[PDB]
């Protein structure tokens, strides 16, 4: 449903809220030729029938989709009695969400002629994903990978180079998301004319907040019809964890113009909002220009970018996407934190209960979500973004309960 | 009426010589080491001082000007050090402006920093990744407290965004960057004729006295670093010699 | 409707092809209660619209199916011109066919009473779904695994655990599957009154190989579906690796009655089928009673089992399922040894031509399906099972891709 | 006709006494020393010798068998190696079945190793994982080679199951099994008059002379492996005092 715009579409520049000027693009003018590029290719191919039928086809017999919509009955005890569903982006191919935003990049980055893709990944989902497409399509791809999230991550990691995609180890900075993605950003800098950057959160410049999360409202299109069939009605919240913000405006964006849906985003409190070693943009950040946007971010008294800490390595990022600065302020979004300790019960919780392991990113989701239902009670319907499987955090995982 | 910096350029082609724009990061080694070192460019022979605003992840810095700016940092450099800076190179009869990221000027407020800026004596106000589609709140600031606003053009810049880049430019236009560089002088001396500075890692007497032959100004930063992080000492003499090769024209 | 008992079932006692055929029940009479058990519970349930809804449901909404049908457009060059389709069996629950069994069975253990579930496992793909369903039905769950297979599946070893159930670590012989599955039938004998053993694979006494093939028939049924759809025509061959044979029996068995279609297995031959360190049941054993069935087996003069050897812990396995016996005697089904260094290739030709890490048991069939392409010729549509994703063998697949040292 | 075995019982149940019946691993620790172990429990009193064939996959097994027999095996025993046995125990006058998995059975040939069997001197096969349901050639073979068949019966089998074995068997009925064993017994003389051996785990004459208040024959195996390991001095002392547990008076 790429081929037709929303009433939620930010202006020609990529400002979201008229006056409050959320998104635009905070690059150097060198980057602004690429930039461009990128913009009317993407303005070019979205109403491209072929471009469409090769992103259905590859998203129906490649990844997967649609992915299913399951009630976890075993959870509704621990919920309050609510009824959580599950919107299964565990079972795509790669294992995450995502691969929705890779598949619609890649192939335009073909269509651009573009013959080098770069991505920078934190949890390396986006890292593996970008890696699977640039092996199908046959383009040359390097990825740059906090030196941190290469140990603890450590799967993935040999998963991208298994794929045939270089992995270059950052250790500048907090040597996780962020400064992997400095290190791509100067990359495209100076290699812009044959590169393509596929960027793997809705945050950027524009038009990446935009584009990315039109590749991923097929989630939330796909739960809006899957709710109702199954529940006979439309939710009462849909939840999901919020790094960048790519998963949680993708499964929102269907919903926004439901007034009875609850939206509420959970990002990663770390060891807790007050002891400076979290990750909650929202609950602690402040307005400003970072990574191409203007929208929240941790950050000091004069400007300086606050390092992030999370147990989650997807989420461990200080910064978030424009387009969910503005739903905050509009009143139509509400975020809360979710600490270390309350993702990983949830985590316990959903591998006893469900017999699904996720990955920590998406237990923050769960962990709201079994919050949310207490305080919405008995019999209410919530759908949670299962962002992605646990198979590269079943080291950590096992550590944290003693299983080793 | 006219620019902050246009007496500046106007002195130099009386010359018959390029403006000799040196930077320096604020904070490195130390606060006061900085601004002696700063003092001692414009003693050296500095037309213009290029004062850095230190950021946490400065994407467009090479590695010289990133680990000093970073070690800064760690010595607790704050955005007020670099308007003590400008108010003492002002003092000691130099011409400042400030180089820095968009996000501390946010932070510190638009209009207040431009006010700010310019009660220290400084002259104007370099954005590497502002570009003028979102300079709303800095043109405006920039008219209302009379200082010079420096954008970057780029080998890349389409010829659409080059003219809008030199047309919101005041003072000079940040040629930032084989043949490009004179290339996109040329580009824009062709649409106007508002001084072009060139910066492109220049290290020796002879790179300044090359650009100055097409650039009204020559831009060194990362050897400037490298020398004082030599010593105060070193830094004089490579500044004398880029003094001298700007004269070359 | 439903599948009812076709003409490919075996008789009431096991066997296949004859009252004193393949199969049959080679056990301990300490086992015939709960065999019967099982037996009439499964026989009562397979006819049961209710059940086969609940199947249905946790199929369709928890495991993701169905499965798409992807065209390996650039492997066509490697396999003779031909046109290779991949049934991504991959993309399920737990990464793996065995999902598909392992509900089926954990719904009738849950119809049956029994509240403790045991099980083998080699690749730990079954041992992570057994797991995943006890977790997702409130069962005690106890695994059983070869030392040697804990060592280079150790990522599933970790998984079975998060999931609550008990990973026992079997010490005894090759210490690989055909171990575990000694100490899981001991585990059995002792427990016959109380647990449910869940195997996983199409072999063992009756009814396991039928009501295993019966949970994996969902996967040659969709396929056969699929590839009318997308090449507009019945394959010419559907091919699969072969351990146990729950996965080729899954994917075979809706195309039995199609005469022109060929089917293709592929079992694990190791270093070589001439070195002694194989899996090639088929190609180098021979008909004999194993593991409660009568089946072909590695074995020496007297009868004792050769063990087995393969990079593949899901393959390494010295028997195979008895309808898969019956089927090579009748001549519908070609069984053929594969190569580690076969599979190896064919999972970095994956890797890094579509982008799918498979697992190593699975590279094997894509290896052979190679072989069949360049026999078949241009054109010839060849539908493979991918039956697992290779997460737990990215270890093992970076070591011998020099990607660590 | 009369089972080979029945003169045995019918002796043993004329001395009021129960038949001490033997189990050992051929091969272990070797063959010959196996064959002198064997020996020395007929000449110690064992009624009838059961003689293990070691089987690479033996799940029936408790670990004391388990890890002799996987011995046996690595010493290189070989099917053969147990008819000689049975010769060996033929010529010192004992009365000896052979107990083994049936696949090196179906190896050597059903008919062939009864054929063998019988010629060796043996009376009779336990058949541990053969049920009646699969024995049909087990059963022609065992008519015309006039050789035993002694089936399982276990505590959890049905009442037809139980009949059905029962009805199968020659010789004895094996009664494999803290009241389960002879209830069981109860249940196999419900039905037939068939002699009823257990095994029980036996270490001692007192768990000997337990089993043999009711059941026709003491099956000992496991305890006798042990006493074998230790030396065969302790298997002679072992074996005397369980030979004087079946006995009652
Ligand atoms: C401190 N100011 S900076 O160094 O010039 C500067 C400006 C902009 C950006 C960066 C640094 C890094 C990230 N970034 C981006 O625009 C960006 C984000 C996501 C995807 C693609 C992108 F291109
Ligand atoms: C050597 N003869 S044995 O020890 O008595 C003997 C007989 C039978 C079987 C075993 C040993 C191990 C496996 N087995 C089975 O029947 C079986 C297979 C798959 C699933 C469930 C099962 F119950
Ligand atoms: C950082 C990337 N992942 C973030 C992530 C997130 C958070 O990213 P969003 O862009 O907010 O959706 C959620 N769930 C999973 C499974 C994730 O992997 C990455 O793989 O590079
Ligand atoms: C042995 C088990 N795996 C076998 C296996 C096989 C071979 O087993 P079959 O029963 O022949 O399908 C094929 N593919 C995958 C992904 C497998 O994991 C196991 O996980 O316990
Ligand atoms: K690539
Ligand atoms: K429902
Ligand atoms: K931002
Ligand atoms: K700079
Ligand atoms: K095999």
């Known amino acids: 449903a790429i081929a037709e715009p929303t009433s939620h579409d930010p202006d020609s520049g990529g400002h979201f809220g008229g006056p409050s000027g959320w998104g635009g693009r905070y690059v150097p003018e060198a980057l602004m030729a690429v930039i461009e590029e990128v913009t009317a290719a993407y303005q070019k191919e979205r109403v491209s029938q072929d471009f469409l039928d090769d992103l259905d086809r590859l998203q129906a017999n490649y990844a997967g989709r649609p992915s299913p919509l399951y009630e976890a009955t075993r959870l509704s005890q621990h919920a309050g009695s609510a009824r959580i569903f599950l919107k299964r982006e565990d079972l795509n191919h790669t294992g995450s969400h995502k691969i929705n935003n890779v598949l619609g990049q890649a192939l335009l980055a073909r269509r651009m002629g573009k013959t080098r893709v770069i991505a920078e990944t934190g949890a390396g989902q986006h890292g593996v994903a970008t890696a699977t497409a640039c092996a199908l399509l046959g383009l040359d791809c390097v990825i740059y990978m906090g030196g941190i999230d290469t140990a603890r991550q450590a799967l993935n990691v040999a998963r991208m180079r298994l794929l045939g995609a270089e992995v270059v180890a950052v250790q500048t900075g907090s040597k996780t998301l962020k400064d992997a993605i400095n290190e791509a950003f100067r990359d495209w800098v100076a290699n812009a004319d044959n590169t393509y950057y596929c960027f793997g959160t809705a945050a950027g410049p524009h038009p990446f907040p935009t584009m990315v999360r039109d590749f991923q409202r097929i989630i939330g299109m796909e739960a809006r019809v899957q709710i109702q069939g199954q529940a006979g009605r439309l939710p009462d919240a849909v939840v999901a964890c919020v790094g960048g913000g790519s998963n949680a405006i993708g499964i929102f964006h269907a919903f926004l113009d439901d007034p009875g849906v609850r939206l509420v985003g959970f990002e990663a409190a770390g060891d807790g909002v007050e002891t400076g070693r979290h990750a909650a943009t929202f609950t602690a950040g402040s307005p400003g220009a970072f990574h191409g946007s203007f929208s929240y971010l941790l950050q000091d008294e004069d400007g300086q970018t606050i390092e992030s800490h999370s147990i989650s390595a997807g989420l461990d990022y200080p910064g978030v996407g424009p387009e969910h600065a503005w739903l905050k302020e509009a009143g139509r979004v509400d975020y809360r934190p979710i600490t270390d300790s309350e993702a990983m019960d949830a985590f316990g919780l959903l591998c006893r209960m469900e017999g699904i392991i996720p990955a920590i990113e998406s237990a923050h989701a769960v962990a709201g979500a079994l919050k949310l239902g207490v305080e919405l009670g008995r019999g209410a319907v919530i759908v949670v973004n299962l962002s992605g499987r646990g198979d590269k955090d079943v080291e950590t995982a096992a550590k944290w309960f003693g299983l080793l | 009426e006219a620019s902050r910096l246009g007496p500046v350029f106007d002195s130099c082609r009386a010359n018959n010589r390029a403006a000799l724009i040196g930077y320096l990061p604020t904070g490195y080694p130390d606060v006061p080491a900085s601004v002696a070192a700063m003092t001692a460019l414009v003693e050296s022979g500095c037309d213009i001082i290029e004062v850095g605003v230190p950021y946490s992840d400065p994407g467009m810095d090479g590695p010289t000007i990133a680990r000093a700016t970073e070690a800064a940092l760690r010595g607790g450099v704050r955005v007020r050090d670099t308007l003590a800076a400008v108010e003492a190179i002002s003092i000691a009869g130099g011409r400042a402006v400030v180089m820095t990221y968009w ?129 105060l000492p070193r830094l004089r003499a490579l500044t004398g010699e880029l003094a001298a090769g700007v004269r070359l024209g």
């Open chain 2, 103 to 231: 996000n501390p000027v946010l932070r510190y407020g638009v209009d207040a920093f431009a006010r700010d800026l310019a009660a220290a004596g400084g002259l104007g106000l370099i954005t590497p990744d502002l570009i003028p589609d979102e300079a709303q709140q800095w043109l405006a600031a920039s008219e209302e407290h009379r200082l010079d606003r420096i954008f970057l053009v780029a080998p890349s810049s389409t010829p659409e965004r080059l003219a809008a880049t030199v047309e919101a430019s005041r003072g000079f236009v940040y040629a930032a960057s084989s043949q490009a560089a004179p290339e996109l002088v040329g580009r824009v001396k062709a649409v106007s004729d508002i001084p072009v500075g060139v910066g492109l890692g220049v290290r020796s007497r002879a790179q300044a006295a090359q650009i100055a032959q097409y650039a009204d100004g020559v831009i060194v930063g990362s050897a400037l670093v490298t020398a004082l992080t030599e010593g």
